[PDB]
Amino acid sequence: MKYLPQQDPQVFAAIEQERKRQHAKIELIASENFVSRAVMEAQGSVLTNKYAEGYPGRRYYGGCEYVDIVEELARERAKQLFGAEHANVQPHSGAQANMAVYFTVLEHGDTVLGMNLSHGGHLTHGSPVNFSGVQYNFVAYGVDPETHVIDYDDVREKARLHRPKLIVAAASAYPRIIDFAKFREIADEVGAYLMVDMAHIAGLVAAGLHPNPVPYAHFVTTTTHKTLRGPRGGMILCQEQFAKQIDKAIFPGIQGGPLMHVIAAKAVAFGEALQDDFKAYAKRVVDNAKRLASALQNEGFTLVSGGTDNHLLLVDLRPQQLTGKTAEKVLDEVGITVNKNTIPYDPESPFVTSGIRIGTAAVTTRGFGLEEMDEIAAIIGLVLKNVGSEQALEEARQRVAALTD
């Protein structure tokens, strides 16, 4: 950097600490990733200076000819990537993409059916302390208590009993492929719209490693960050018939001016995702998650659902008599970043939990492969099986440092 170090030493020192931290730790938090230098340069551009309320060619302010080109590049590349008929690349976040779909199809107090928050559903899928739960009446479907796979008969029974106006499929912590075709079949049976929130798996969807929700859902929401490896922000995909309403929900509905510099970065990330090497990257993400899962089972760990079909896995720590909070804390002591995460039918609260969630998108971006996954599992086994040994923790620290250089 050139001007920040001189204008603001305090902010610059903190950023530099964060940059070095990203390199030194082993990032296993499933929602994380490292964006390219080109994506960062796009969001570090002069596009932050432009007001551009409205849409390309339909703006409220003049002088938007060149930010219009950027926004269209983002929309057209998104459409090529996911095969959607319409894209809205203005959502400030995944939360705002969800908020706008809800604002489009629901009235205050309408019934919504989404995944149980303890089984993998997201905060914006009905938490009582989130706007979703406050504004609407959310009901939940769960996973099977033994297989930990969504119970599609439970989705259908809840739908038929509660008659939701909207059904939400997808999750922040579900390690198996979701059957969007069954979700649409149930939605049609009860006359509900189907919304798929693919935030966690969007990069896998783009690389063809997860079934695409686009053909089955009326609305698809997502973050541009996460497995898609874009800048932090949101996006909505939908059929041509809801395009005008979705665009109006975003603006003048729920947001004001869009972040054009972040939209430029979304276009950049979409161009990267359209390339063949992104598909090779995504395959390594899923391959690494399978490998890591297997290596952890080899150390004696129990995994929710027995493994994974995607980028993430959940360790049920009950057999080791540990809470997710204890495991997260001791792994933090050795340089391994995970987050505690409730598991299906968890006996512990969401602030303690009996599990940890792990994803491989970030370590895959940094070049880790199968041999690194084996070592990561071996380190986690060493630590979690020896939480009271400072000897074991120091060894883990040295093995973590050997992986990160």
Residues 159-218 that bind ligand PLP (CB under 6 A): 170-172, 197, 199-200
Distance in angstroms (rounded) separating the CA atoms of residues 73 and 405: 38
Active site residue 51: yes
Cross-strand partners of 337: 27
130 scored as a contact of ligand PLP (CB under 6 A)? no
- Tokens read off for 66: 């060149």
Q: At closest approach, how far in Å is the CB of 290 from ligand PLP?
A: 21
Active-site hit among 124, 221, 223, 342: 223
Active site residue 340: no
Distance in angstroms (rounded) separating the CA atoms of residues 400 and 392: 12
Among 104, 223, 227, 326, binds ligand PLP (CB under 6 A): 223
Q: At closest approach, how far in Å is the CB of 343 from its own copies?
A: 17
Measured CA distances, 134 to 131, 138, 171 (Å): 5, 9, 20
401 scored as a contact of its own copies (CB under 8 A)? no
End-to-end CA distance of the chain: 23
Region from 127-135, 141-149, 254-262, 335-343 binding ligand PLP, contact rule CB under 6 A: 254-262
Q: At closest approach, how far in Å is the CB of 378 from ligand PLP?
A: 29
| Partner in contact with 391, chosen from its own copies, ligand PLP, none, beta carbon below 5 to 8 Å by kind | none
Helix, strand or coil for residue 257?
A: coil
| Paired sense of beta strands 166-169 and 137-141, if any | unpaired
224 scored as a contact of ligand PLP (CB under 6 A)? no
Distance in angstroms (rounded) separating the CA atoms of residues 21 and 10: 17
**Total of residues contacting ligand PLP (CB under 6 A):** 17
Nearer of residues 5 and 83 to its own copies, judged by Cβ = 5
Active-site hit among 232, 318, 385, 397: 232
Ramachandran quadrant class, 378 (left: phi over 0; alpha: psi -120 to 50; beta: rest): alpha
Is 108 marked within a binding site? no
Distance in angstroms (rounded) separating the CA atoms of residues 119 and 122: 9
Nearer of residues 361 and 400 to ligand PLP, judged by Cβ = 361
Task: Name the residue among 320, 339, 342 with its Cα closest to residue 331.
Answer: 339
Specify the DSSP class assigned to residue 21. Answer: H
67 scored as a contact of its own copies (CB under 8 A)? yes
Active-site hit among 53, 151, 154, 185: 53
127 scored as a contact of its own copies (CB under 8 A)? yes
Note whether 316 and 275 are within 8 A (CB). Answer: no
Contact set with ligand PLP (CB under 6 A)? 31, 93-95, 98, 122, 124, 170-172, 197, 199-200, 223, 255-257
So which residues are the catalytic ones?
A: 51, 53, 197, 223, 226, 232
